[PDB]
Amino acid sequence: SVENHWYYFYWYMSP
Amino acid sequence: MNKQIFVLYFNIFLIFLGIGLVIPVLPVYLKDLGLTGSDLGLLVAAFALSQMIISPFGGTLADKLGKKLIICIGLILFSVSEFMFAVGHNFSVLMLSRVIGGMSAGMVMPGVTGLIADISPSHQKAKNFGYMSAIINSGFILGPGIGGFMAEVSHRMPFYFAGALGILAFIMSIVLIHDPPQLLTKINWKVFITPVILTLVLSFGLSAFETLYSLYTADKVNYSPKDISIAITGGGIFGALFQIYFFDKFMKYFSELTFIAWSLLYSVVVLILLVFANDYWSIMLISFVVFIGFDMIRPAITNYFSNIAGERQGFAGGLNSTFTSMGNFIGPLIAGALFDVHIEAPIYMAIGVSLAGVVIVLIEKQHRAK
């Protein structure tokens, strides 16, 4: 699903 | 462009105007009631350290609860923080206000970056990042530029104005915005080192110069805040104009590393030229030159990050912000102590950090060539 998750200090895009 | 992106950029700009507001007044603030330069550096250092401490928790919270709500709460806390600064009278209340403001900034920014990344497709994850960089630099430069100006009448309302601006940003953002783990292990982090040190250097130099300039020029030439205002505004405008209207022209005839090295040499020479100057008009002219020098490096570093990251632009955009905060925290804290031990020491450390950057550029380039 197009949605971003937050790791430490940066966002990363779901597959 | 959709207005939502405009307001998301305006939030960044407001945060970095808050981070830069204090500098114009800095001498008269605490050399009228009996403080020293150490705490003058410590104030802005506390702001940036609060930002650093708080960004992870704020990011995570925002991810687990929402972005618009976090952004609005952040803006509210920033406005409250900035209004608290304008009513304090001792050092502890000012320290608490700066820490609160750091908190608001560090839990604002993750929401704004998340929303921008969520609204920009894969074809706009570079142009919008460049716009973010540009807005951050413009806000940081123009913070003092406007904070000096209205300080001349009713001294204690450049934070009143900032508070009012902040609540306006709050209400505009809530009304208009229509928004109802092992990845590291793979990473070699053996190429990311030199862009990280370069952005650390650049942030250190810019923040330390901004911190030391007001104190030095008020001590030697007895600058009123109007003079510091006009110097910083002119500097920033000249640098931004030279950037926008000649960057593409210089890229055709150099490489990124050589461009950065020559810009750094230009910066280090203009700093000593500033040291030797002892006149009002002279030191007024040197500001334009020094900001022209400092405005070139940042886009080169952003392009370097973009070209090395490849697909995962978020990682580079996060490292850039994290180490920009690192520089913004470590610069003024050292600069205050250096201005305490001597008068010309902060410029000497600026020289040193710039030459450091030159040397790392040189070594990096040498070992890529070999």
Residue numbers in the entry:
A (entry chain C): 126 to 140
B (entry chain A): 1 to 180, 193 to 382
Quote the authors verbatim.
Here, we uncover the proton-coupling mechanism of the Staphylococcus aureus efflux pump NorA by elucidating structures in various protonation states of two essential acidic residues using cryo-EM.
Unlike results at pH 7.5, we discovered NorA did not bind to Fab36 at pH 5.0, indicating a unique conformation induced by the lower pH value. We deduced residues Glu222 and Asp307 of NorA were predominantly protonated at pH 5.0 by showing that a double mutant mimicking the protonated state (NorAE222Q,D307N) was unable to bind Fab36 at pH values of 5.0 or 7.5. Structures of NorA and NorAE222Q,D307N each displayed the inward-occluded conformation (backbone Cα r.m.s.d of 0.82 Å), where the substrate binding pockets were partially occluded from the cytoplasmic side of the membrane and fully closed from the periplasmic side. For the inward-occluded conformation, TM5 of the NTD was primarily responsible for obstructing the entrance to the substrate binding pocket through interactions with TM7, TM8, TM10, and TM11 of the CTD. Carboxyl groups of Glu222 and Asp307 tethered TM7 and TM10 to TM5 through hydrogen bonds to backbone carbonyls of Phe140 and Ile141 and to the side chain of Asn137, respectively. Nevertheless, the hydrophobicity surrounding these residues likely promotes the occluded conformation by excluding bulk water and reduces the effective dielectric to strengthen the electrostatic interactions involving Glu222 and Asp307. The similarity of interactions with TM5 and overall structural correspondence between wild-type NorA and double mutant structures supported the conclusion that Glu222 and Asp307 were in the protonated forms in the wild-type NorA structure and that the E222Q and D307N mutations suitably mimicked the protonated forms.
